[PDB]
Design an enzyme around this catalytic site. Structure first.
Site, short mmCIF file in Angstrom:
data_model
loop_
_atom_site.label_atom_id
_atom_site.label_comp_id
_atom_site.label_asym_id
_atom_site.label_seq_id
_atom_site.Cartn_x
_atom_site.Cartn_y
_atom_site.Cartn_z
CG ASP A 32 49.55 -23.11 60.70
OD1 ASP A 32 50.24 -23.46 59.72
OD2 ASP A 32 49.14 -23.90 61.57
N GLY A 80 43.84 -31.73 53.90
CA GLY A 80 44.11 -33.15 53.76
C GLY A 80 45.22 -33.39 52.77
CB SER A 93 45.49 -26.99 54.76
OG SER A 93 46.50 -27.78 54.08
CG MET A 94 45.53 -29.49 50.01
SD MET A 94 46.25 -28.39 48.73
CE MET A 94 45.47 -28.99 47.22
CG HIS A 139 49.13 -24.70 56.06
ND1 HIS A 139 49.11 -25.79 56.90
CD2 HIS A 139 48.70 -25.15 54.85
CE1 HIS A 139 48.70 -26.85 56.23
NE2 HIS A 139 48.47 -26.49 54.97
O1 LIG Z 1 47.58 -27.42 54.83
B1 LIG Z 1 47.81 -27.57 53.52
C1 LIG Z 1 48.73 -28.71 53.11
C2 LIG Z 1 49.18 -29.90 53.74
C3 LIG Z 1 50.02 -30.78 53.07
C4 LIG Z 1 50.43 -30.47 51.74
F1 LIG Z 1 51.25 -31.30 51.09
C5 LIG Z 1 49.99 -29.26 51.10
C6 LIG Z 1 49.14 -28.37 51.77
C7 LIG Z 1 48.50 -27.02 51.36
O2 LIG Z 1 47.62 -26.61 52.47
#
Ligand SMILES: *O[B@]1(*)=C2[C]=[C]C(F)=[C]C2=[C]O1
Ligand SMILES: *O[B@]1(*)=C2[C]=[C]C(F)=[C]C2=[C]O1
Ligand SMILES: *O[B@]1(*)=C2[C]=[C]C(F)=[C]C2=[C]O1
Ligand SMILES: *O[B@]1(*)=C2[C]=[C]C(F)=[C]C2=[C]O1
Ligand SMILES: *O[B@]1(*)=C2[C]=[C]C(F)=[C]C2=[C]O1
Ligand SMILES: *O[B@]1(*)=C2[C]=[C]C(F)=[C]C2=[C]O1
Ligand SMILES: *O[B@]1(*)=C2[C]=[C]C(F)=[C]C2=[C]O1
Ligand SMILES: *O[B@]1(*)=C2[C]=[C]C(F)=[C]C2=[C]O1
Ligand SMILES: *O[B@]1(*)=C2[C]=[C]C(F)=[C]C2=[C]O1
Ligand SMILES: *O[B@]1(*)=C2[C]=[C]C(F)=[C]C2=[C]O1
Lengths: 180, 181, 183, 183, 182, 183, 179, 181, 181, 179
Positions: F163, F60, F89-90, F114
């Site tokens: 990715d 997000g 991701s986060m 990523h």
């Molecule tokens: O997937 B993941 C993402 C989206 C957007 C931004 F600004 C940063 C980062 C790390 O892991």
């Protein structure tokens, strides 16, 4: 669509044939009226052939065509193919007496006017009075052109009324079913 | 919205026999107002009820459900216009107990004729026109009785939208008093 | 919307404690489910005391309306019906369904009767099935209205061909209600 | 919608205390999950007392309907079924699924039976898989309806080819219910 | 929807008896709720088993694996009971119940198939997405092989197209242990 | 959704009483505000007992993620992180942010890393400002991931260019988690 | 699209009419006009009507049908691709002995489709109308194929797809045109 | 678009017996292609015709209208794939006169099974399934005849979308030659 | 738009063997360009043809229809980039007759890898991925032949969008000369 | 609109009317007209009227490079407004033959664009639009005589100039006064 240089409809118009094959709106009426005036100007004695396959449309556009037919000098024969409904069947019945035809499987439908109104009570009353006067005008002319009484036309148009070509002849909307 | 020490604010006012009509009048609003009126009558059939009205109007039949319930129950229903009472809102304002119809000084009152619509066959349009014309006659006859104006004057004065100040509404007979501070 | 002190009730729940049911909307399956459940609940609480059904309704689903109609006729308590505002279509049918002698309208309430409305799309065979079904539904409604009003089926058929708006006084003369409730 | 004094119940929760379940909508997975949960809860409260399932439903998902059907057949209590308004498609299937001798309809309720409806898009192979699946589903439904009504599978197949609307009296003659409930 | 006599909704009342109702598509919100219910029930009693009813068309593969791994992680047995339909990740979770305690009601349907997904973008990105969904299919097939006793090659063949099974066929296949009779 | 007896908790509130926080959605400002508030509340209740953060999240907002990340590093209790389903991701950044030795994934959970995604529209000068900002954000993320995994910044840069999907076992080998949790 | 005349106008000069779309009022108007024009040019030479059509409006189809039966020239009909619904009705309407299909062309016959909304009385009127329309179609198909009306009714209850060879056996066409 | 009396570019090519199929195949496209084929046969029944194909496919019945017209008329129809011939496009490519089916070296050919849809009662879904399965058998039988592959191999090779290079299409028997510069 | 019997401006240029490619490349554009190339070859098989390119690219198969037609016909096709030649546009720029590929000094050339999409079962996504990867290899192999760069360098240089000036495009081998005033 | 159409009639007198946003279709037409006019007469000059809010930078450079490439002088005449790539093309006319009418407006600014995706892709797009701005500024510097640093400062925000200011700036050579 096809070309003959004429498109196919322009080619038929050269032989005094007008093809009414759609809903009747102001654009269609303007074109049909213009064709009728043009044909009268070319020859005021030869008759004109109006083919009708139409679900109906605007009552005022239909009356523009109706009054032009009655106004011009040539006879206008009317020939129903497919369907003549609502103002379409009114125009079918408007052809020169003795020269109103339907093909054997063509359908004819008669009904009362349709419309709408929104707004204040006073405005709804004005719209109701107008559409009721329009119905009386249509019924009176249909009575004259079919020989049926106004009361019978009123009863027979209260709901949608579908007629075969043979029934339309018995009713007086056409003069003959055209056989092959 | 707020809660009081638990009632929402409107429920708390209803405990003191105050009903707040503050929206367009549709069937849901009328069903709630009628239910509150019947409930208050069942709690005490003698004490009067206070109906605040800030409403642009709404459904004529929903408005008549409220109107007939007001006339049916035993308690007097005082009506108090704040903001605006238009169309069926001004009809309900005029329906309060005689002598107990009020508007605040800057409140507006608007009277007009019914609005509606109709589509279909000529026969159906005629039925709808006759119905809305009968509805207008019914409204005008009751407004005549509640204001003391003649039916002909009410007809003329509602042909177009007619906006009245609180003082003009009192002169007209739609309310009895402008409530001063 | 509002709540009432006692625990706590919304205003409709408070009226239901006094055997009052408020029908104030279009009649769909959810509304019928709720009204039927309230009728069964009230019968279970007391099978002798009557029930009061207020009706302000433009009508709605015919089958949802018949769920309410049959439940009214099935349960032991009398169901009084009181029209406020408008009872149209299945709403006027339910108004006429109240206990005989206990069907009322307030003086400015409106009652409207009409024939069923519906739709059908598909093959000719399917359109025929739908037409036969809605025609049988109309005959069923007319037969019951004839029984509840005392009018002949032929008169009900003629009088519902187009939308027919009645005043409360006319509805009483017609036999849809027994009395106009005066103040 | 309304609440009832006791703590507090909505009207349906109050009826559920008396072992009444109200099926008053289209049958989808959420409705089936709720009805199944109510049936399991009632069995756990008392495995001998019967349960009352009111049905006013146009039908819905076939698999959601079978979740309810199999739960009815699985639990120990009898489930009486009572049609009010309309039981169509999987609704009429569930009506016919009640305990034998305890399937009812009110006199003006309607019952409709038909064949399954569905759809398929994609490659020829995928359309074939979907067609085979819906045809097997129809055979499964017809076989159970045959067992619950006493009609032959061939008659059920013929009678569901097109939508078939039955009165309560016809549904009793057909074997979908045992009795028309009179007032 | 309904409330029972403090006050529970019907599902909360069943959860008190260690019953979890999975009656929808499986997305992240549904998985978060089911996982939380499983952890809560384990914390209440780590020995009594849990009953997971499944009527589900499937849903997100990662949401399904959140539920799957939580079932395998906790100490109580989780019985699984298919009513209506268990399709896609729904049938995967049905097969994930404690061995000997996986059931379907007689008219319930079970459907198995291969993963579905999508990819858009550069060739390199489409390749990454294809490799990912192919690895996901291998992971699912390997677990289904372990839980059913069928070979991975048979599961691959039988999921190439959508495959609808009756409860009796699902038992013969090894997805459930018993058809529950009345 | 469900409620648990005790007063009355929803299921998540009941788990929070045992110091369990469930991150089961995309990370936006509302989610971060709630998670941060739960972390501060748990620290105020007991500053020594550790906290359990379950993560099933596609990622997000980067700034919402850093609000959670910095709060985890700020408070006194250890925060264990447990990936179920997916941490992308986060989400995978927060998974790697748990107390060292107390970062876990279940065996079939997926971890995806990523580079940042974003957008910019407007004048050349504004596009340059946005590009510089997202490039600085990537360097900040890579530097922290390097510290938490033991991989070099250059390897993290190469491995996040596209990715990159990892199994739980690969995430452990990478240093994003400490252990795959076995049954 | 291409010019030579557009391609269709060029074929019309050789008395060929191409029906290659759904049949609505505009298409019927054009086809009827072409038939009348060709009869006026030469009332003895026959006309060739190619049909690749999923069907369309029943009344538009009958406008074409009645015009074919009315005019003096024979109208040969040639199905390519598909003739379904009113398309297969027009295929069967060609001059007896001069109705053809190419070997992989498909012919589909079915019952009319329609819709109705409104009061019970209006739904009844619409149902009666579409049922009369079906009887009219079946009666003509019976005459043109030699099958009984009862067989046509049974065979059109559901959509019925025929190969060209089956359409010939049925009597909808006279010959499968071979290369 | 461009003009070359006056012709658009396609009309100018048609004068040299070249037909350009460069779009999805629907009923309008088939009506035009069939009309061009009949016109060219009427102009000269012996000279062959050149049909260029760059098409993702389209309606199966529109494709068969073109296919049967090609087989019906007296002239040979050479087919030349440029770009892509997929689905009914590759079917028409394979339908050209034997020995006169070509593809340019980087053109692509894709073969697959029919696609369609069905909604309604079980009985109607069964009718639609039977119809599309018969359509697939008809296509496979003709492809078998035109390529020399067995029906079983065509069935296996069209179960999923199957993309062929021009050289592979020649080895398969869908074309006779890859046209070199 | 403007007219110059009577030609539109593009028809007038086509009389001098100039073809203007000034849009995205889809099947309609390719069908028109191919038809113009065949027409010009039929008018004179020795004189060369001038293809102006200002195009962001478009369909890969439509681009290959044009590419193969250029390589097939006898006349040399000079290519002249004005504005931008991106994606399949830069591929067609590089496809002109060797020694006769040009760009104006401020024209831009962009090279990149193919873009596409796929949805459905894992098996179908795999088929689509394999197809687009084979398409990329086909493009890279031809670009290698036309530029003299190795396939590995083209692969590296197209991994992300790569914008070149006209001078850089000449150094790369995509064109032969920057056209000076 | 009126009838040659009016624009074709002006093109016969070597007048090209640029009266819209500059996209690839407009550039293709303008380039084609320039090449056509050069082929008709390589010595007579050409008149390019400009009323344009700007448009695509690459479409604008297609026109710009064609103007510089062909042999005839291209006079440029601003009426109404020449903004963004429109003012760039105004400044591109033959030196001494760039004009504006007295109430015409000239607007100069920096490039606009957008980018979405991974950080790496945003960086590529930013570098590209920054190089595009440097290319535009360098040419404007050459055509106006202003330094690149002044053009950069003066285009940081939208900068509206009167015709007289555009002449003082070096974007045009003369304000055309009435005849
Ligand atoms: O997937 B993941 C993402 C989206 C957007 C931004 F600004 C940063 C980062 C790390 O892991
Ligand atoms: O149908 B029809 C119609 C419609 C509308 C109007 F107004 C009129 C009429 C007659 O016919
Ligand atoms: O406004 B208001 C109104 C509306 C509608 C109706 F119906 C009525 C009324 C009165 O006021
Ligand atoms: O209105 B009303 C109605 C509607 C619908 C149906 F079905 C029925 C009925 C009666 O009333
Ligand atoms: O209606 B009903 C239905 C629908 C769908 C399915 F699947 C099944 C069924 C039975 O009933
Ligand atoms: O169905 B199912 C599915 C979907 C998607 C994914 F990814 C996976 C799976 C399994 O089952
Ligand atoms: O398909 B088909 C059709 C449709 C509609 C109608 F009405 C008729 C018919 C015959 O065929
Ligand atoms: O692709 B392709 C197709 C589609 C659809 C159908 F039906 C058929 C076919 C062949 O190829
Ligand atoms: O850009 B570009 C492109 C796109 C898509 C594809 F498929 C290919 C290509 C090359 O360049
Ligand atoms: O305005 B203007 C512009 C826009 C965009 C780009 F890219 C560039 C330019 C210059 O001017």
């Amino acid at each position: 669509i096809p070309t003959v240089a004429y498109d196919i409809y322009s080619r038929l118009l050269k032989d005094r044939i007008i093809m009414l094959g759609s809903q009747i709106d102001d654009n269609v009426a303007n074109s049909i009226v213009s064709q009728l005036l043009f044909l009268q100007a070319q020859d005021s004695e030869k008759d004109i052939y109006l083919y009708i396959n139409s679900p109906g449309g605007s009552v005022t556009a239909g009356f523009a065509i109706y009054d032009t037919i009655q106004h011009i000098k040539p006879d206008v024969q009317t020939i129903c193919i497919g369907m003549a409904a609502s103002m379409g069947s009114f125009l079918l019945a408007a052809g020169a007496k003795g020269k109103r035809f339907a093909l054997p499987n063509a359908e004819v439908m008669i009904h009362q006017p349709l419309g709408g109104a929104q707004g204040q009570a006073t405005e709804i009353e004005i719209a109701a009075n107008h559409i009721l006067k329009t119905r009386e005008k249509l019924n009176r002319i249909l009575s004259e052109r079919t020989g049926q009484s106004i009361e019978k036309i009123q009863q027979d148009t209260d709901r949608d009324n579908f007629l075969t070509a043979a029934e339309a002849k018995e009713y007086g909307l056409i003069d003959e079913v055209m056989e092959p």
